[PDB]
Amino acid sequence: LYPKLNQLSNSINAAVAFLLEARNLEGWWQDFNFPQAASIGDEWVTAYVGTMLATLPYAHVHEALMQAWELLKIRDHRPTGEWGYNYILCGDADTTGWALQLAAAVGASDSERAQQARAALATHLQPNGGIATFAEESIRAYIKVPDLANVSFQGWCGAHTCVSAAVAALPEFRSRLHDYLRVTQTSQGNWEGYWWSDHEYTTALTAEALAAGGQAADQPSIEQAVAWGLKRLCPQGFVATSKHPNGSTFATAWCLRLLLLNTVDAEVKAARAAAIGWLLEQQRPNGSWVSSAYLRIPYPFDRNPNQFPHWRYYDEIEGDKAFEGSIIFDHNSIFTTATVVNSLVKAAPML
Ligand SMILES: CC(C)=CCC/C(C)=C/CC/C(C)=C/CC/C(C)=C/Cc1cc(C(=O)O)cc(O)c1O
């Protein structure tokens, strides 16, 4: 089926063109907004989008990633050597983790800044063997809200499965985070993230990290995650959520990445074909995909955001509004598009 492969090419090329044109003056990828507060993310989004595009074999994409890495090196204002949501935010383990994946793609894992950043990641390792997003002193020093002045930050500064999964993509950390990632798997075979509504994100990344480890003992856990991924994907080739009952592009893209970890099962191959089919049909004329990268802001004290039923979408809230207990999305559609195009490139050869 050469027409379906040619459409994947045309779809991927349209998405890459959108992403390259979507960069700002300096050349940053920007997405998400905390209006009249944390403002727009760059360091994080650029680190993620750069890592997503690393799978492309194009020379002009690699040039964009080398510029992305140069822009990150210039962000050297934090004494830890970490990267944050944007300039004004303190360093976090997730951003730093994604920046180190981009570093590896541009052959800069051995660089001074990469070594300093990897060293800083080690401080975020918790007793239970997981990675915490924030150090309490850093995030408290930034936050200047009266309501959250002397509240607990053990939610934001506790070990997170979503961040631990992403950081475990780094070979230096995969072995240390292994045991934490194994015990945090649910009976249904999936994982649950802290900052993300869609479990497919954390499930795909954890399974990929375990797969990269190459340990036979982890294969049953991977196969149980794939089986869960197959249940989540409906016959029409999309992941249905409460928000998007006719399919989330973000969740489906990550589910498609999860299903690449089984390459023998005929039913899994058929599901991937269905997922590619739907994603191709959903792509907008400008090459982007409709924003569905839902980032939630738990209360600083909340360790269990998956047990928080009061989630509201920040932009739909009538009246004066706080970010705590609210969900924000990628308004530029750069985070979503980067996720989808990455999944389509990795999935194309397994048709
Ligand atoms: C971990 C990840 C998925 C990506 C790595 C990048 C991260 C850290 C993504 C998470 C989302 C968060 C919380 C990012 C920091 C920004 C912030 C502390 C937002 C809340 C807030 C701010 C302010 C304020 O700016 O003053 C006032 C608030 O009331 C308020 O809730």
Coordinates of C-alpha atoms and ligand atoms in Angstrom, one line a residue:
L1 CA 0.0 0.0 0.0
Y2 CA 2.2 2.8 -1.4
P3 CA -0.7 5.4 -1.4
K4 CA -1.0 5.1 2.4
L5 CA 2.9 5.4 2.8
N6 CA 2.9 8.5 0.4
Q7 CA 0.1 10.1 2.5
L8 CA 2.2 9.5 5.7
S9 CA 5.1 11.3 3.9
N10 CA 2.8 14.2 2.8
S11 CA 1.2 14.3 6.3
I12 CA 4.6 14.2 8.1
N13 CA 6.1 16.9 5.8
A14 CA 3.1 19.2 6.2
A15 CA 3.4 18.8 10.1
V16 CA 7.2 19.5 10.0
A17 CA 6.7 22.6 7.8
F18 CA 4.1 23.9 10.3
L19 CA 6.4 23.3 13.3
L20 CA 9.5 25.0 11.7
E21 CA 7.3 28.0 10.7
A22 CA 5.7 28.1 14.2
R23 CA 9.1 29.1 15.9
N24 CA 9.5 32.7 17.4
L25 CA 12.1 35.5 16.7
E26 CA 14.9 33.7 18.6
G27 CA 13.8 30.3 17.2
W28 CA 12.1 28.9 20.3
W29 CA 9.0 26.6 20.1
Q30 CA 6.4 28.1 22.5
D31 CA 3.2 26.5 24.0
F32 CA 0.9 26.5 27.1
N33 CA 0.0 29.8 29.0
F34 CA -0.5 30.7 32.7
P35 CA -2.1 34.2 31.9
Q36 CA -0.8 37.1 34.1
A37 CA 1.5 34.7 36.0
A38 CA 4.1 32.0 34.7
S39 CA 3.3 33.2 31.1
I40 CA 4.3 31.0 28.1
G41 CA 6.7 27.9 28.2
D42 CA 9.7 27.8 25.8
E43 CA 12.7 25.9 27.3
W44 CA 10.3 22.9 28.1
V45 CA 8.3 22.9 24.9
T46 CA 11.5 23.4 22.7
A47 CA 13.2 20.5 24.6
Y48 CA 10.1 18.2 24.0
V49 CA 9.4 19.3 20.3
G50 CA 13.2 19.0 19.5
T51 CA 13.3 15.4 21.0
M52 CA 10.0 14.5 19.1
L53 CA 11.6 15.7 15.7
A54 CA 14.9 13.8 16.4
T55 CA 13.3 10.7 14.7
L56 CA 13.2 12.7 11.3
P57 CA 16.1 12.0 9.0
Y58 CA 16.0 15.5 7.3
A59 CA 19.2 17.7 7.4
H60 CA 17.1 21.0 7.9
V61 CA 15.3 19.4 10.9
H62 CA 18.8 18.5 12.5
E63 CA 19.8 22.2 11.9
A64 CA 16.6 23.3 13.8
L65 CA 17.6 20.9 16.7
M66 CA 21.2 22.2 16.8
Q67 CA 19.7 25.8 17.0
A68 CA 17.3 24.5 19.7
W69 CA 20.3 23.1 21.7
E70 CA 22.3 26.4 21.3
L71 CA 19.2 28.4 22.6
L72 CA 19.0 26.1 25.7
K73 CA 22.8 26.5 26.4
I74 CA 22.3 30.4 26.4
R75 CA 19.6 29.7 29.2
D76 CA 22.5 29.3 31.8
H77 CA 21.0 31.7 34.5
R78 CA 20.1 29.0 37.2
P79 CA 23.1 28.0 39.4
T80 CA 22.0 24.2 39.3
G81 CA 22.4 24.2 35.5
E82 CA 18.7 23.0 35.2
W83 CA 16.0 24.1 32.7
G84 CA 12.5 25.2 33.6
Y85 CA 9.0 25.9 32.0
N86 CA 10.5 29.3 30.8
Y87 CA 13.2 31.9 31.9
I88 CA 11.3 33.2 35.0
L89 CA 10.5 29.7 36.4
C90 CA 13.0 27.7 38.6
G91 CA 14.6 24.4 37.2
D92 CA 12.5 21.2 37.1
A93 CA 13.6 17.5 36.5
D94 CA 11.1 17.0 33.5
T95 CA 12.3 20.0 31.3
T96 CA 15.9 19.0 32.2
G97 CA 15.3 15.4 31.2
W98 CA 13.8 16.4 27.8
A99 CA 16.7 18.9 27.2
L100 CA 19.2 16.0 27.8
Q101 CA 17.3 13.8 25.2
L102 CA 17.7 16.7 22.7
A103 CA 21.4 17.0 23.7
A104 CA 21.9 13.2 22.8
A105 CA 20.2 13.8 19.4
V106 CA 22.8 16.6 18.6
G107 CA 25.7 14.6 20.1
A108 CA 26.1 16.9 23.2
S109 CA 25.4 14.4 26.0
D110 CA 29.2 14.7 26.8
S111 CA 29.0 18.5 26.9
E112 CA 29.8 20.4 30.2
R113 CA 26.2 21.8 30.5
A114 CA 24.8 18.2 29.9
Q115 CA 27.0 16.8 32.7
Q116 CA 26.0 19.7 35.0
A117 CA 22.2 19.1 34.2
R118 CA 22.5 15.3 34.7
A119 CA 24.2 16.1 38.1
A120 CA 21.3 18.4 39.0
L121 CA 18.7 15.6 38.1
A122 CA 20.4 13.3 40.7
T123 CA 19.2 15.8 43.5
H124 CA 15.5 15.1 42.5
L125 CA 15.9 11.3 43.2
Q126 CA 13.5 10.5 46.2
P127 CA 13.9 7.7 48.9
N128 CA 11.2 5.6 47.1
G129 CA 13.5 5.5 44.0
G130 CA 11.4 8.0 41.8
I131 CA 12.2 11.5 40.4
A132 CA 10.4 14.6 41.9
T133 CA 9.7 17.6 39.5
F134 CA 10.7 20.5 42.0
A135 CA 12.9 21.1 45.0
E136 CA 10.7 22.7 47.7
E137 CA 13.1 25.8 48.2
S138 CA 13.2 26.6 44.4
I139 CA 9.3 26.4 43.7
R140 CA 8.4 28.2 47.0
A141 CA 10.9 31.0 46.2
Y142 CA 9.1 31.5 42.8
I143 CA 5.4 31.2 44.0
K144 CA 4.3 34.6 45.6
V145 CA 0.5 33.7 46.1
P146 CA -1.0 34.6 49.6
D147 CA -3.4 31.5 49.7
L148 CA -0.4 29.2 49.1
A149 CA 2.1 31.1 51.4
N150 CA 2.6 28.5 54.2
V151 CA 0.8 25.4 52.5
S152 CA 2.5 22.0 51.9
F153 CA 4.3 21.5 48.5
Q154 CA 4.8 17.7 49.1
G155 CA 2.5 17.0 46.0
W156 CA 4.7 19.1 43.6
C157 CA 8.0 18.0 45.4
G158 CA 7.1 14.3 45.6
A159 CA 8.2 11.5 43.2
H160 CA 6.1 11.6 39.9
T161 CA 5.6 8.6 37.5
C162 CA 5.2 10.8 34.4
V163 CA 8.6 12.6 35.1
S164 CA 10.3 9.3 36.2
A165 CA 9.2 7.7 32.9
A166 CA 10.6 10.6 30.8
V167 CA 14.0 10.8 32.8
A168 CA 14.3 6.9 32.4
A169 CA 14.7 7.5 28.6
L170 CA 18.3 8.6 29.7
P171 CA 20.5 5.4 29.9
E172 CA 22.3 6.9 33.0
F173 CA 19.0 6.9 35.0
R174 CA 17.1 3.9 33.5
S175 CA 18.7 1.4 36.0
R176 CA 18.1 3.6 39.2
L177 CA 14.4 4.3 38.3
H178 CA 13.7 0.6 37.2
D179 CA 12.3 -0.7 40.6
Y180 CA 10.1 2.5 41.1
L181 CA 8.6 2.1 37.6
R182 CA 7.9 -1.6 38.1
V183 CA 6.0 -1.2 41.5
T184 CA 3.9 1.8 40.2
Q185 CA 2.2 -0.2 37.4
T186 CA -1.5 -0.7 38.1
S187 CA -3.4 -4.1 38.0
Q188 CA -4.9 -3.0 34.6
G189 CA -1.3 -2.9 33.2
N190 CA -1.1 1.0 32.7
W191 CA 0.6 3.8 34.7
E192 CA -0.9 7.1 36.0
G193 CA 1.0 10.4 35.6
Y194 CA 1.0 13.5 38.0
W195 CA 0.9 16.5 35.6
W196 CA -1.1 14.7 32.7
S197 CA -4.8 13.8 32.3
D198 CA -4.0 11.1 29.6
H199 CA -2.4 7.9 31.1
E200 CA -1.2 6.9 27.6
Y201 CA 1.7 9.5 28.0
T202 CA 3.2 7.9 31.2
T203 CA 2.3 4.3 30.1
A204 CA 4.1 4.6 26.7
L205 CA 7.2 6.3 28.2
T206 CA 7.5 3.8 31.1
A207 CA 7.1 0.7 28.8
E208 CA 9.6 2.3 26.3
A209 CA 12.1 2.8 29.2
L210 CA 11.6 -0.9 30.4
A211 CA 11.9 -2.1 26.7
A212 CA 15.2 0.0 26.3
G213 CA 16.6 -1.8 29.5
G214 CA 16.5 -5.1 27.6
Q215 CA 15.7 -7.2 30.8
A216 CA 13.6 -10.3 30.1
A217 CA 12.0 -9.9 33.6
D218 CA 10.3 -6.6 32.4
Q219 CA 8.8 -8.1 29.2
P220 CA 5.5 -9.3 30.9
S221 CA 5.0 -5.7 32.3
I222 CA 5.5 -4.3 28.7
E223 CA 3.1 -6.9 27.2
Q224 CA 0.4 -6.0 29.9
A225 CA 0.9 -2.2 29.0
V226 CA 0.5 -3.1 25.2
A227 CA -2.7 -5.2 26.0
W228 CA -4.1 -2.1 28.0
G229 CA -3.2 0.2 25.0
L230 CA -5.2 -2.2 22.7
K231 CA -8.3 -1.9 25.0
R232 CA -7.9 1.9 25.0
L233 CA -7.9 2.2 21.2
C234 CA -11.5 1.8 19.8
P235 CA -12.2 0.0 16.5
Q236 CA -12.4 3.5 14.7
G237 CA -8.6 3.8 15.6
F238 CA -8.7 6.5 18.3
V239 CA -8.5 6.8 22.2
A240 CA -11.8 8.2 23.6
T241 CA -11.5 10.5 26.7
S242 CA -14.2 12.3 28.9
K243 CA -13.2 15.6 27.1
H244 CA -13.0 14.1 23.6
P245 CA -15.4 11.1 23.4
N246 CA -14.7 10.9 19.6
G247 CA -10.9 10.8 20.0
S248 CA -7.9 12.7 21.6
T249 CA -5.0 13.2 19.1
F250 CA -2.5 13.5 21.9
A251 CA -3.6 10.3 23.8
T252 CA -3.9 8.3 20.5
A253 CA -0.4 9.4 19.3
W254 CA 1.1 8.1 22.7
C255 CA -1.1 4.9 22.5
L256 CA 0.3 4.4 18.9
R257 CA 3.9 4.7 20.4
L258 CA 2.9 2.1 23.1
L259 CA 1.7 -0.4 20.5
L260 CA 5.1 -0.3 18.6
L261 CA 6.6 -2.4 21.6
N262 CA 4.8 -5.5 20.2
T263 CA 5.7 -6.3 16.5
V264 CA 4.4 -10.0 16.2
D265 CA 0.7 -9.8 17.3
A266 CA -1.6 -9.4 14.2
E267 CA -4.3 -7.6 16.3
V268 CA -1.8 -5.0 17.6
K269 CA -0.5 -4.3 14.0
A270 CA -4.2 -3.9 12.9
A271 CA -4.9 -1.4 15.8
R272 CA -1.8 0.7 14.7
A273 CA -3.0 0.8 11.1
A274 CA -6.5 2.0 12.4
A275 CA -4.7 4.6 14.7
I276 CA -2.5 5.9 11.7
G277 CA -5.7 5.9 9.5
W278 CA -7.7 8.1 12.0
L279 CA -4.7 10.5 12.8
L280 CA -4.2 11.1 9.0
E281 CA -7.9 12.0 8.6
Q282 CA -7.8 14.4 11.6
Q283 CA -4.8 16.5 10.3
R284 CA -5.8 20.2 9.6
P285 CA -5.0 21.8 6.2
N286 CA -2.0 23.9 7.8
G287 CA -0.4 20.5 8.8
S288 CA -1.2 20.8 12.6
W289 CA -3.5 18.6 14.8
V290 CA -6.2 20.0 17.1
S291 CA -4.7 20.7 20.6
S292 CA -5.3 17.9 23.1
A293 CA -2.1 18.0 25.3
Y294 CA -4.0 18.5 28.6
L295 CA -1.6 19.6 31.5
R296 CA -3.4 19.7 34.9
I297 CA -2.2 21.9 38.0
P298 CA -2.9 19.9 41.2
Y299 CA -2.8 21.8 44.6
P300 CA 0.8 21.9 45.9
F301 CA -0.2 19.5 48.8
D302 CA -2.1 17.0 46.6
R303 CA 0.0 13.7 46.1
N304 CA -3.0 11.9 44.4
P305 CA -4.3 14.1 41.5
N306 CA -5.8 10.9 39.9
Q307 CA -8.1 10.9 43.0
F308 CA -9.1 14.6 42.4
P309 CA -12.5 14.6 40.7
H310 CA -13.0 18.5 40.7
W311 CA -10.8 19.0 37.5
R312 CA -12.1 22.0 35.3
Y313 CA -10.7 23.4 32.0
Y314 CA -9.1 26.8 32.9
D315 CA -10.3 28.6 29.7
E316 CA -14.0 27.6 30.2
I317 CA -14.1 28.9 33.9
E318 CA -16.7 31.8 34.2
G319 CA -15.6 34.2 36.9
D320 CA -12.3 35.0 38.7
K321 CA -10.1 31.8 38.6
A322 CA -7.0 30.1 40.1
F323 CA -4.8 27.5 38.3
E324 CA -5.0 25.0 41.2
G325 CA -7.5 22.2 40.3
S326 CA -7.7 23.4 36.6
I327 CA -6.5 22.0 33.3
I328 CA -4.6 24.0 30.5
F329 CA -3.8 22.9 26.9
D330 CA -1.2 23.7 24.1
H331 CA -2.9 26.8 22.6
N332 CA -0.4 26.9 19.6
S333 CA -1.0 23.1 18.9
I334 CA 2.9 22.7 18.7
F335 CA 3.1 20.2 21.6
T336 CA 0.2 18.0 20.2
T337 CA 1.5 18.2 16.5
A338 CA 5.1 17.3 17.5
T339 CA 3.7 14.3 19.5
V340 CA 1.5 13.1 16.5
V341 CA 4.2 13.5 13.7
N342 CA 6.8 11.7 16.0
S343 CA 4.3 8.7 16.4
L344 CA 3.5 8.6 12.6
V345 CA 7.3 8.5 11.7
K346 CA 8.1 5.7 14.2
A347 CA 4.9 3.7 13.2
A348 CA 5.2 4.1 9.3
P349 CA 7.7 1.2 8.8
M350 CA 5.6 -1.2 11.0
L351 CA 2.6 -1.1 8.5
Ligands
LIG1 C1 6.5 18.6 34.8 C2 6.1 18.9 33.3 C3 4.9 18.1 32.8 C4 6.8 19.8 32.4 C5 8.0 20.6 32.8 C6 7.5 22.1 33.0 C7 6.5 22.0 34.1 C8 7.1 22.1 35.6 C9 5.0 21.8 33.9 C10 4.0 21.6 35.0 C11 3.1 22.9 35.1 C12 3.7 23.9 36.1 C13 3.1 23.9 37.6 C14 4.9 24.8 35.7 C15 5.5 25.8 36.7 C16 4.7 27.1 36.6 C17 3.7 27.1 37.8 C18 4.3 27.2 39.3 C19 2.2 27.3 37.6 C20 1.2 27.3 38.8 C21 1.1 28.7 39.2 C22 1.9 29.7 39.0 C23 1.7 31.0 39.4 C24 2.6 32.0 39.1 O1 3.2 32.1 38.0 O2 2.9 32.9 40.0 C25 0.6 31.3 40.3 C26 -0.3 30.2 40.6 O3 -1.4 30.4 41.3 C27 0.0 29.0 40.1 O4 -0.9 28.0 40.4

